[PDB]
Structures are given as C-alpha cells and as structure tokens.
Write an enzyme that holds these catalytic residues in place. Structure first.
Site, PDB file in Angstrom:
ATOM      1  N   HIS A 156     -14.183 -13.590  10.859  1.00 18.20           N
ATOM      2  CA  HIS A 156     -12.952 -13.981  11.528  1.00 18.20           C
ATOM      3  C   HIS A 156     -12.974 -13.492  12.969  1.00 18.20           C
ATOM      4  CE1 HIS A 156     -12.189 -13.200   7.200  1.00 18.20           C
ATOM      5  NE2 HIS A 156     -11.677 -14.416   7.263  1.00 18.20           N
TER       6      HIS A 156
HETATM    7  C1  LIG Z   1     -12.069 -17.038   5.284  1.00 20.79           C
HETATM    8  C2  LIG Z   1     -11.235 -16.004   4.511  1.00 20.79           C
HETATM    9  O1  LIG Z   1     -11.572 -15.713   3.440  1.00 20.79           O
HETATM   10  N1  LIG Z   1     -10.001 -15.392   5.164  1.00 20.79           N
HETATM   11  C3  LIG Z   1      -9.100 -14.394   4.541  1.00 20.79           C
HETATM   12  C4  LIG Z   1      -9.815 -13.087   4.154  1.00 20.79           C
HETATM   13  O2  LIG Z   1     -10.647 -13.303   3.048  1.00 20.79           O
HETATM   14  C5  LIG Z   1     -11.431 -12.182   2.761  1.00 20.79           C
HETATM   15  C6  LIG Z   1     -11.754 -11.214   3.771  1.00 20.79           C
HETATM   16  C7  LIG Z   1     -12.549 -10.092   3.451  1.00 20.79           C
HETATM   17  C8  LIG Z   1     -13.030  -9.926   2.147  1.00 20.79           C
HETATM   18  C9  LIG Z   1     -13.875  -8.745   1.797  1.00 20.79           C
HETATM   19  C10 LIG Z   1     -13.920  -7.541   2.705  1.00 20.79           C
HETATM   20  C11 LIG Z   1     -14.520  -8.695   0.493  1.00 20.79           C
HETATM   21  C12 LIG Z   1     -14.341  -9.857  -0.439  1.00 20.79           C
HETATM   22  O3  LIG Z   1     -15.144 -10.070  -1.325  1.00 20.79           O
HETATM   23  O4  LIG Z   1     -13.225 -10.721  -0.256  1.00 20.79           O
HETATM   24  C13 LIG Z   1     -12.707 -10.904   1.130  1.00 20.79           C
HETATM   25  C14 LIG Z   1     -11.917 -12.014   1.443  1.00 20.79           C
HETATM   26  O5  LIG Z   1      -8.863 -12.098   3.765  1.00 20.79           O
HETATM   27  C15 LIG Z   1      -7.899 -11.732   4.868  1.00 20.79           C
HETATM   28  C16 LIG Z   1      -6.590 -11.474   4.261  1.00 20.79           C
HETATM   29  O6  LIG Z   1      -6.793 -11.002   2.897  1.00 20.79           O
HETATM   30  C17 LIG Z   1      -7.733 -12.807   5.953  1.00 20.79           C
HETATM   31  O7  LIG Z   1      -8.628 -12.480   7.087  1.00 20.79           O
HETATM   32  C18 LIG Z   1      -7.976 -14.173   5.532  1.00 20.79           C
HETATM   33  O8  LIG Z   1      -6.712 -14.727   4.966  1.00 20.79           O
END
Ligand SMILES: CC(=O)N[C@H]1[C@H](Oc2ccc3c(C)cc(=O)oc3c2)O[C@H](CO)[C@@H](O)[C@@H]1O
Ligand SMILES: CC(C)(COP(=O)(O)OP(=O)(O)OC[C@H]1O[C@@H](n2cnc3c(N)ncnc32)[C@H](O)[C@@H]1OP(=O)(O)O)[C@@H](O)C(=O)NCCC(=O)NCCS
Ligand SMILES: CC(C)(COP(=O)(O)OP(=O)(O)OC[C@H]1O[C@@H](n2cnc3c(N)ncnc32)[C@H](O)[C@@H]1OP(=O)(O)O)[C@@H](O)C(=O)NCCC(=O)NCCS
Ligand SMILES: *[C@@H]1O[C@H](CO)[C@@H](O[C@@H]2O[C@H](CO)[C@@H](O)[C@H](O)[C@H]2NC(C)=O)[C@H](O)[C@H]1NC(C)=O
Ligand SMILES: CC(=O)N[C@H]1[C@H](Oc2ccc3c(C)cc(=O)oc3c2)O[C@H](CO)[C@@H](O)[C@@H]1O
Ligand SMILES: *[C@@H]1O[C@H](CO)[C@@H](O)[C@H](O)[C@H]1NC(C)=O
Ligand SMILES: *[C@@H]1O[C@H](CO)[C@@H](O)[C@H](O)[C@H]1NC(C)=O
Ligand SMILES: *[C@@H]1O[C@H](CO)[C@@H](O)[C@H](O)[C@H]1NC(C)=O
Ligand SMILES: *[C@@H]1O[C@H](CO)[C@@H](O)[C@H](O)[C@H]1NC(C)=O
Ligand SMILES: *[C@@H]1O[C@H](CO)[C@@H](O)[C@H](O)[C@H]1NC(C)=O
Lengths: 550, 543
Positions: free
Chosen positions: B183
């Site tokens: 992101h």
């Molecule tokens: C493209 C995307 O996934 N964006 C969302 C993001 O997703 C994630 C981000 C990080 C992780 C990590 C760290 C491990 C995992 O295995 O799972 C994830 C899933 O989480 C954040 C809020 O929770 C926001 O930046 C976005 O809404």
C-alpha cells in the site's frame, strides 16, 4: 495473594541454628524415584535469637517432600512430607530442641484450590451461563419480532461416546483450568486428559467396522473401499502434519524442525492398518440363531481369528521391542521417564526403547520437544507420545474398537447378548490391566503410560470404553431414555471440531485475556466457556446439516 | 552481509579537515519530509586519510541526500541519486567543495527483469510440476489391476472478483516485499491499493444482481431485509473476531481490539447500500440512449450525493484541534513536519474521537515512510461514506448489466460512458498527480478521487470482461472465477492460514525478493488451486 503463581506456596525457612550450613531439598510425592532437587540454601544464623530466613516457593499440585541436611556435614537434619496449599504462607522453623527438629507453621491459610470451587461454584457458574444463554436466545427473537410488530442409520451411542470424548478433549487441550488432574500424567498413571485419545482410537475402530460392513453390504467393491481407506489415512496424516502439529505463531515451518508424528498421524496410520486388515478379512455379517436370549456363540471372534492372530503378533512385537531392544547408553527394557526419574541415573533416557526408535528413525529434531514428563522429571531429551512403537498399541486399541463394533452390529436385535459381551470384554480387559499394573501408578509389570502407549494403558482404556458403551448403548439406543442431548453433535462433527480447535486456538470466543493469569478459577471459567462454545458450534453445524467427513 | 532488503551500503569519505559533515536523507517519493539524519561523518584526522562512515540507504525508489555542516549549518553539496539494492556506493567529498559518489559494486536490483522473466519461469515450472503430479493419478491405478438465482451467474463479475482475490492474496502475503505490491504511503496508487475498492464495487454489483433476482423470483422485502441485516452483522463479527486481530501476540482484550476492519467496512457498506436498494426497489424493465438506470435510482443517487457532500464537508471543514482544518496530509515528518501527530486529519480525528486511539490500526501505511507515531485506521468511520459511494457505483454497474440484458451494445455504451465520466472526474480532482490536486488519490482516507479512479478502472475491467467472457465467450476466466465463487471463504482462509506451510515456509534468506516473490506466487497459486478444488466439489460458502 503474593508473587506466587499457579499452585505455588511461599515457604519461609528460619535457620535458627548457629553454625550449620543448611540446604533445603524438595521432591514431589508424584515422583516415583526422583532426585532431591535443591530448593533454597538457608545460611546459618549470625547469633542466637536472630535466625536467618530465606524465601522459597514450593509446589502444590501434588504433595511435597522436604529433606533438610547440613551442607557441610552432609548429615540429615529432619524430613517433612507436607501438602502445601495453593497460596499458603507456610513457615518452617528449625532449631535445637535441647536433637535438631523442624517445626512447620501455617502463617496464612491456603486458597485450597478445587476445595473452594468444589462442585458448588461449578454448579453456580453452569447455571449462570445457561441462564445467560437462554436470555440471549429469548431476546434475540425480540429484535426480529420488533420489525414484525412495527410492520443403516448412524448409531447414536457411538456418537454420544465420541461427543463425550471430544468435549473432554477440548476442555483438557485448552488447559482445563490448568489443574494437574486435567492435564497429562507426567510419566505414569492415569488422568482425565489421558483418557480421550485412546477413546478416540477405540471409537475410530468401531466406526471403521461399522462403515466397512455398511459399505460392503451396500454392494461396493473392496478395491474402491481400499482407495477410500488409503485416501482418508493420507488426508489425516497430511492434515495433522500441516495444520495440527506445528505452532505457526512461533514462525514459518522449516523441515529441520518439523514434528513428523502427531495425533492425526497416529490416527491415520492406525486407521489405514486396521481398516486394510478388516478389508482383507471381511466376512459378511450373519443373521442370529433366532434365539437372541443368552447365546454363547463366539462367532464374532471365530470369524475374525486372522485379525486377532495378527494383532497378537503385533503386540508380541511391541513387547519384544520394548523389553528386549538394547538401547545404547540405557538399560534394556527401560520404561522410566529419564531426566531425574529412577534416581537420575538415566537422564537422557526418556521412554527407553520407544524413545530410541523415535530418535533413530525420525531424528531428535522431528519429535515432541515438550513431553509431558518435562515439567516434573526434567527430561532434557525430545520424546514424542505419538511415536512409532506406540503405534502398535494404537492399532491394537483400534482393533479392540473394531471388536466392539462387531459385538454391537452382529447381534443388532439381541441387546441382551450385546450387553453380555460388552460386560465380558470389559471384565477381561480390566483383569488384564489389573494383572499388568497391579493397581499401582508406577509399580507393576507395565504401568499405565500414555507416552509409551503401554499395553496396560490400552487394556485399561479399552475396559473403560467398553463399560461406557455398556452404559450408553441401552440408555441411548435400546431403552431410549436419553439421546446424548449435549454430546452427539460433536460426535457427528468430530473431525471439524478437532481441526477447528487446533486452528482457532487463541480466537476470542475460545480464549481471551485474563485479569489474573495465575488463577485457577479464571482459567477454568475460560476453558469451560470455550468448550461450551465448541459444543454450541457443533450443535449449529448439526441443525444445519453441515457434516465435514474425510 | 550486514545490509537488509531493499538497501544499499553507502560509504561516505570526507577529505575536509575543517568541517564535520552530517548526512541527511530523504526519500524522493515523500511529498514534504524532514531531512532525517543518515550518518554523522567527522572530519579527516590528517591529510590524505579521509574519515570513513558507512550507512545504509533505502533503495526502493529515490534517495535525496543533503550534506550540510554540523557546525556552520551550511550545505556543501546536494545529490539526488537513486541507489540500487545490495549496492556499494562510495561518496568522496573534497575541497575542489564537490561530491563525486562513485559506485564500487554494481547493484543487484532485484526489481529488474529478475522479477519478470524469473517470475514467468517459476510459473512455468509450477504449472509443469502440477500437471506432472495430476497426470499420474488413474493410469498407475489402471495398470495395478493386473496384479489383483433463476439466471446463471454472470461470470464477468465472477472473473473480476477472482482477479481481485488473486491480487489480494498476492499482495497481502507481501508480494515479494516489493514496494509497488504494498500500500502506497498515504497519497498514491499501487497494485495493492487497487484490490479493496474493486471488492466493494463487485460487492455492490452483486448486491443488485442478487437483490433483484430475490425480489423477482419468490421473496418479499422484509425477509430480504432480515437477510441483509444478518449478513452485515456476520461480516462485522467475522472482521472483528477472526480477521482483524493477529492472535500470535496473545489473547484478545478490549483495550487492544481493532474495531474497524476490511470486513467491518464491507458489512457496514453492504447494510447501508443494500437497505437503500431494497427501499427504493423497482422491477427491471426490458434505445441507443435510454438513461433508465439513473431515472429509476434517482432517490438512491440523491442520498449518495448527500453522503458525498457530508464526507467532503467533514474532511475539508471539521475543526481538528491542534491540526489545520481540511488536512489530507500524513503527519509524522510529512508536510514539512509541522504536524507531527495529524495522520488523516478529519478522518483520523473522527476515528480517535469515537472509537478511541487504542481501537485503531496501530501500524498504518504511512508509518514506514512518514514516521507517523499515531494510530490511523484505513477502514475508519469517515471513509465508510466513500466506501458506500463506490458500493453504489457497483450497484449502478449491476443496474447496467441487468437492465440491458438483451442489447450488449446498450451495456458497453453505458460502461464506457461511466468509465469516461469517472476518469474525467478523477483527472479533475487529482490533476493527474498523486500528491497534488484538490483530493489526491489516497486509500487511507478513501478519498473521493480514489473512489472515482478505482470505479473507472472497475468499469473498464467490466467493459473488457463482459464481452470476452459473456457476449461472444472468447475466454471464461480459467484461473479466476474459481476464487470468484468462493471469495468469502478464500478471504477468511488466507486471513486464518497466513503462516501455514503451503502458504508460508522458512526462507534461506529473508532479505531476498526472489525468495519472497516465489513464496507469495506459490501461496497465491495454491489458493487458486484450493478454490478450484472447492468448485469441483461445489462447496461454495456464502453469507
Ligand atoms: C490489499 C489489501 O489487502 N488491503 C487491506 C489490508 O490487507 C492486509 C494488510 C496486511 C496484512 C498482513 C500484515 C498479514 C496478512 O496475512 O493479512 C493482511 C491483510 O489490511 C489493511 C486494513 O486491515 C488495509 O491496508 C487494507 O484495507
Ligand atoms: C479422526 C476422526 C474423525 C475419526 O473418527 P470416526 O469415528 O471415524 O469419525 P467420522 O464421523 O469422521 O466417521 C467417518 C465414518 O464413520 C462411520 N461412522 C461413524 N460413526 C458411526 C456410527 N455411529 N454408526 C455407523 N457408522 C458410523 C461413517 O461411515 C462415517 O462416514 P459417512 O457418514 O460419510 O459414511 C476422530 O477420531 C477425530 O476427530 N479425531 C481427532 C480427535 C483426537 O484424536 N483427539 C486426541 C486428543 S488431541
Ligand atoms: C464476497 C465479498 C466480495 C462480497 O460479497 P459478493 O461480492 O456480494 O459475493 P458473494 O460471493 O458473497 O455473493 C453474495 C450474493 O451475490 C450473488 N452474486 C454474486 N455474483 C453474482 C453474479 N455474477 N450474478 C448473480 N448473482 C451474483 C450470490 O449469488 C449471493 O446472492 P444470494 O443471496 O442469491 O445467494 C466479500 O464478502 C469478501 O470476500 N470480502 C473480502 C475481500 C476484501 O474485502 N479484500 C480487501 C483486501 S483484504
Ligand atoms: C542429605 O543428607 C543425607 C545424610 O547424609 C543424605 O543421605 C545419604 O547420603 C549419602 C551421600 O553421601 C548416600 O550415599 C546415602 O544413600 C544417603 N542415605 C542414607 C540413608 O545414608 C542425602 O542423600 C542428602 N541429600 C541429597 C539430595 O544428597
Ligand atoms: C488429550 C491430548 O492432550 N492429546 C495430545 C496432545 O493434544 C494437545 C496437547 C496440547 C495442546 C495445547 C497446549 C493447546 C491446543 O489447543 O491444542 C493441544 C492439543 O498433543 C500431544 C501430541 O501432539 C500429546 O501429548 C497428546 O497425545
Ligand atoms: C555457611 O556458608 C557461608 C557461605 O555461604 C559461610 O560464610 C559460613 O561460614 C558457613 N557456615 C559455617 C558454619 O560453616
Ligand atoms: C508470611 O508471614 C510472615 C510472618 O511475619 C510475613 O512477614 C510475610 O509477609 C507473610 N507473607 C505474605 C505473602 O504475606
Ligand atoms: C567534529 O567533531 C569532533 C567531535 O569528535 C570535534 O572535536 C571537532 O571539533 C568537530 N569539528 C569541527 C570543525 O568543529
Ligand atoms: C542543511 O543546511 C542547509 C544550510 O542552510 C539548510 O538550508 C538545510 O535546511 C539543512 N537541512 C536540514 C535542516 O535538514
Ligand atoms: C565496498 O567497497 C569497499 C571498497 O572496495 C570495500 O572496502 C568494502 O568492503 C565493500 N563493502 C562490502 C559490503 O563488500
């Protein structure tokens, strides 16, 4: 009530003696032959009337044996065998009486773990939880009504048995209040947590025979049922190795530290072996002799004599490997816990022959690094309770379950004969277990050991399972007085519940942060709520017919 | 050796015996960052023996270095070189005052075609291995016998959702730890930023595609409202319990629970937009320019415009205490560091005021670059308005897909019109600049220009998918719609099974892009395979 934690009583020791270096030795009463570990070193008092005191924290789970001997003179002063409470403030005063005697005083009364809660607090908590659940269920429909106002069947005794085993397993896997009797026995003996897995193998064998005979009488070739058996065993092994065995919170999985054996590995291997045996020798189930009253015919065993012969050969192989396999740097036929067990003369000898076979075939890194004996006997080696030698007794117990299924399916409309045979099998297995163990936790020819999966362990747990079936089959199947009302939903969703509670270990409904992490009441409440929630999830997956099967 | 992933060891030698040189670093992509001190280089003890100082500089994109004296506070030279991964750069400065910056070891630059050609090779190897494993299934067994919902699913929305799911599984696991598969730090658009808005758009499209079928087939509106409310509650609860907390740090507590989340935002937007659609629901009627899909949804359009006005007013007018009004900046060292704790501005202030600081994303996407010290939740309260707006844009796409079923041209014309309108709106808002413009594209704030840009992208994807996969049937989405039909299960599984062996194993070197990228590609391929396996057995999970 102090810096103590989780069954630990603080023991002040006043060395009122003038010119004696005093050391304090401690050993639990659960240890069979354990070394006296060093507890605290109380120095000599500088002068008379001003004793020198030190603080030591003794254990509480099961007894305590304190030995006081002079550090320099190496001569015993006195001995105690007290049973210190959970959070007591016991004080020990040792002084000359005129030779040298020690006096123990209870400065503060213990919390008396499991004495205070007993059954009264358990009943109160259960009633409160039930009332809260009922109120939530009743008020849940209030919101829905506000909008409206505005404008071959599966045997049920086996299901109840498996549900009981599953509920107990979910309770004792989460900790069971971290109580010592809801955890695993250190090396020998039987606890509440040691019962479920042999019951699971027994029920697996019973269901093996039930499913085998149902599918075969449905008109299915043995070559397709063999594929089903092999695929189910392979799926069990892979599911266990990938999902169940490793703790992924620590880090990514690396083959150098992969625990190959496990609960599901053992279940899959034994399922494959015993199911392939039954498929190889699969006689069709015959109709009864039309009497069905007190028939003495042993057609159940005479129709499976090849399986019995091979199972006895396997048991003889297990006995020969356990008692007659030279283990380097270890006595032949060792059954002790190692570490400090057996007076500590064999520290790196946990298990004995079974441990040697595990460490040889699978390697030291591919074994359970936190065996149940590590806490008490201080075993520094890695021993895996679901090893290779114990798989033979797991197969034997699965075949005993197959025998129970034969008993309950041959004489389907002869419940008197079913109860007679269940009583006979329970009696003979109890006699074998009482001959092997001689009613002793650590004595006898073969003690009741889960880590070794002893033959006496198999016989004892099979006798318990046969008695449980004798209690359940009439009540839940023949008489119909009960339906396993809170039990048989986990009985139907066993694999789903096991995999889920292995995966959803720390998730909020099953685990939340505690105000007092060293309290038995808080841990017990959390574990009971988690078990009840798993029962509720199983009931939900029963109401909506979602039955995951391998 | 001592270097880390996406870093280069920058050696700096100063031949000046009269001015100590302190080294200031600033990434080129940051909008307005303080020149954070990189390394302090003392003066040379003697002539001909320059002092040597070793520092590691980020090599992801750009590196603006400023050298100013630690005593006179005057700059001596300025360089804006873009270093490369695992490089070895020697910067010599001497009185001539000029800076040379001679490269010693050529950078590895793992972001180079070693991430394209090697990726294609790895995909080919994985496909070949899977085919070889699957081939030897029945032939060996045969040789061993000798020794013995009125209309069907659109599949275009399904293919779009499957593409979004593959992208989310790839970029959530890290995406090779590349900077463009994560992101973007505050303003900007990356491959990871494109996923969630597409999911909301597809959620709205499916909302209409299922709501109209339910109302037309056999059901009433009250039962549908009950189903919508129950699904929203289930999504919110799943997001709060299963997905948001990472339980490897310990048991959940109320003082450290993240109330917002991806699934919480999806559930809230589902409830709002599905309730709006159900309230203003009319039968679908069977002209080169009909414009019926807007005349039949004018009440919902008015409500969405009012919500957008509310979002704009709150963002640009809510008085944030200790913060300028209308703040879209990232805080930390961003915006010249004048607002150290202002991440988000109005949206962050609303989140911290209502849900509290402890119930927010402790580690936002701006912490890596702008060094923000506050907690800002990307799925906050204020951004839910724009999430609802884009869910309704997806509902509009579904209205186009369902009104003009007979005439494909009557679908493509509306799709290209909507894509052009939203692209023009986004171009006007952002001034085709990631950091300039009235409302820069920003996923953390879910800016209106972000919604318009991603909805124009979604409309273009639908315009290129509906014909190919539906009208003339050139290509059903072979690796795509299998997750498309299992989206919720795939999301829950990859949010539960992050660390499990098939999707994650130990690496030989954690500071390598060729290893993380291979791991993430294997994990995404395995999730596609799992979704395909569930499609074969028809184990679709809904609600
Ligand atoms: C493209 C995307 O996934 N964006 C969302 C993001 O997703 C994630 C981000 C990080 C992780 C990590 C760290 C491990 C995992 O295995 O799972 C994830 C899933 O989480 C954040 C809020 O929770 C926001 O930046 C976005 O809404
Ligand atoms: C692995 C496990 C599911 C196997 O047990 P099972 O009794 O074989 O369980 P299932 O319900 O999965 O049974 C599979 C088949 O058994 C047969 N079966 C089970 N109960 C039956 C009954 N009462 N009557 C007739 N057939 C029955 C059926 O054929 C069923 O398959 P179908 O319904 O598709 O035909 C179970 O033992 C388990 O969950 N183990 C993990 C728990 C554990 O070992 N814990 C140890 C401590 S961690
Ligand atoms: C599934 C998800 C995308 C939203 O749901 P959806 O897009 O509405 O898809 P689902 O597959 O849940 O379908 C729900 C309804 O849509 C219907 N539907 C979906 N696609 C359809 C189509 N092409 N044609 C007709 N109906 C369709 C389904 O049939 C169901 O309707 P029913 O009520 O008649 O059964 C969402 O819950 C999800 O997966 N979220 C996680 C992804 C995410 O947000 N990632 C961000 C990065 S972490
Ligand atoms: C504590 O002191 C007593 C008194 O000597 C020890 O008892 C004997 O110790 C000797 C060691 O020299 C052993 O050989 C004997 O077998 C012990 N028992 C008897 C009856 O003599 C005791 O061992 C000491 N505690 C520890 C842990 O060593
Ligand atoms: C009744 C029982 O404890 N059975 C086996 C045991 O299961 C467990 C044991 C511990 C846990 C833990 C600690 C948490 C959890 O949530 O899951 C578990 C599951 O694992 C060991 C082998 O892996 C063996 O000691 C036993 O055979
Ligand atoms: C007891 O041990 C201490 C050292 O810990 C020593 O100084 C003291 O002299 C010892 N007492 C006797 C009586 O030897
Ligand atoms: C135990 O009793 C002694 C007796 O004076 C006291 O000093 C000590 O504080 C008590 N321990 C605790 C934990 O209260
Ligand atoms: C550079 O720093 C050192 C500190 O070690 C200091 O002694 C020296 O005076 C500084 N140089 C100048 C020109 O001030
Ligand atoms: C470095 O020194 C120059 C010289 O005046 C100054 O303009 C610049 O702001 C300094 N860099 C900082 C303070 O980050
Ligand atoms: C970088 O180059 C210099 C000069 O050749 C050398 O001394 C240094 O060891 C190099 N660094 C690494 C990490 O190889």
């Amino acid at each position: 009530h102090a810096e103590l934690k989780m069954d630990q009583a603080l023991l002040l020791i006043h060395n009122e003696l003038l010119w004696t270096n005093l050391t304090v030795y401690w050993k639990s009463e659960c240890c069979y032959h354990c070394l006296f570990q060093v507890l605290v070193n109380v120095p000599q008092s500088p002068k008379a009337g001003k004793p020198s005191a030190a603080a030591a924290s003794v254990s509480t789970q099961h007894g305590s044996i304190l030995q006081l001997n002079d550090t320099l003179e190496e001569k015993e002063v006195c001995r105690l065998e007290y049973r210190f409470g959970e959070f007591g403030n016991y004080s020990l005063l040792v002084k000359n009486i005129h030779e040298i005697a020690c006096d123990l005083a209870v400065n503060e009364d213990p919390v008396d773990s499991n004495l205070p809660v007993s059954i009264a607090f358990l009943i109160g908590l259960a009633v409160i939880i039930v009332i809260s659940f009922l109120r939530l269920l009743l008020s849940l429909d209030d919101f829905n009504n506000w909008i409206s106002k505005a404008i071959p069947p599966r045997l049920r005794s086996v299901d109840t048995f498996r549900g009981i085993a599953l509920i107990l397993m979910v309770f004792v896997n989460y900790g069971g209040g971290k109580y010592w009797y809801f955890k695993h026995a250190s090396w020998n003996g039987l606890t509440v947590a040691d019962l479920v897995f042999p019951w699971f193998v027994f029920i697996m064998g019973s269901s093996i025979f039930l499913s085998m005979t149902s599918i075969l009488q449905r008109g299915c070739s043995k070559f397709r049922l063999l594929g089903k058996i092999a695929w189910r065993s392979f799926l069990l092994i892979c599911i266990g190795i990938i999902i169940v065995n490793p703790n992924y919170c620590l880090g990514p999985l690396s083959w150098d530290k992969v625990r190959i054996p496990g609960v599901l590995q053992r279940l899959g291997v034994t399922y494959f072996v015993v199911a392939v045996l039954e498929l190889l020798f699969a006689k069709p189930v015959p109709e009864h002799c039309a009497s069905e009253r007190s028939c003495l015919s042993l057609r159940d065993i005479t129709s499976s004599w090849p399986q019995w012969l091979l199972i006895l050969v396997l048991e003889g192989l297990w006995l020969g490997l356990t008692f007659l396999l030279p283990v380097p740097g270890c006595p032949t036929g060792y059954l002790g816990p190692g570490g400090i067990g057996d007076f500590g003369k064999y520290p790196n000898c946990t298990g004995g022959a079974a441990g040697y076979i595990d460490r040889l075939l699978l390697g030291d890194d591919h074994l359970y690094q936190h065996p149940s004996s590590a806490v008490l006997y201080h075993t520094e080696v890695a021993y895996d309770p679901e090893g290779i030698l114990g798989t033979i007794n797991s197969i034997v117990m699965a075949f005993l379950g197959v025998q129970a299924g034969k008993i309950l399916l041959y004489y389907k409309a002869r419940t008197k004969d079913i109860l007679i045979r269940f009583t006979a099998w329970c009696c003979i297995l109890g006699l074998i277990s009482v001959a092997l163990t001689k009613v002793s936790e650590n004595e006898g020819f073969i003690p009741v050991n889960k880590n070794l999966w002893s033959l006496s362990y198999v016989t004892t747990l099979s006798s318990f399972a046969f008695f449980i079936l004798l209690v359940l089959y009439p009540v839940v199947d023949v008489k119909g007085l009960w339906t396993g009302t809170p039990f048989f939903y986990p009985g139907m969703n066993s694999i789903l519940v096991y995999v889920g509670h292995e995966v959803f270990e720390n998730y909020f409904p099953f685990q939340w942060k505690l105000k007092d992490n060293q309290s038995h009441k808080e841990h017990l409440t959390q574990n009971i709520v988690a078990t009840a929630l798993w029962v509720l999830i199983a009931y939900i997956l029963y109401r909506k017919k979602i039955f995951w099967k391998i």
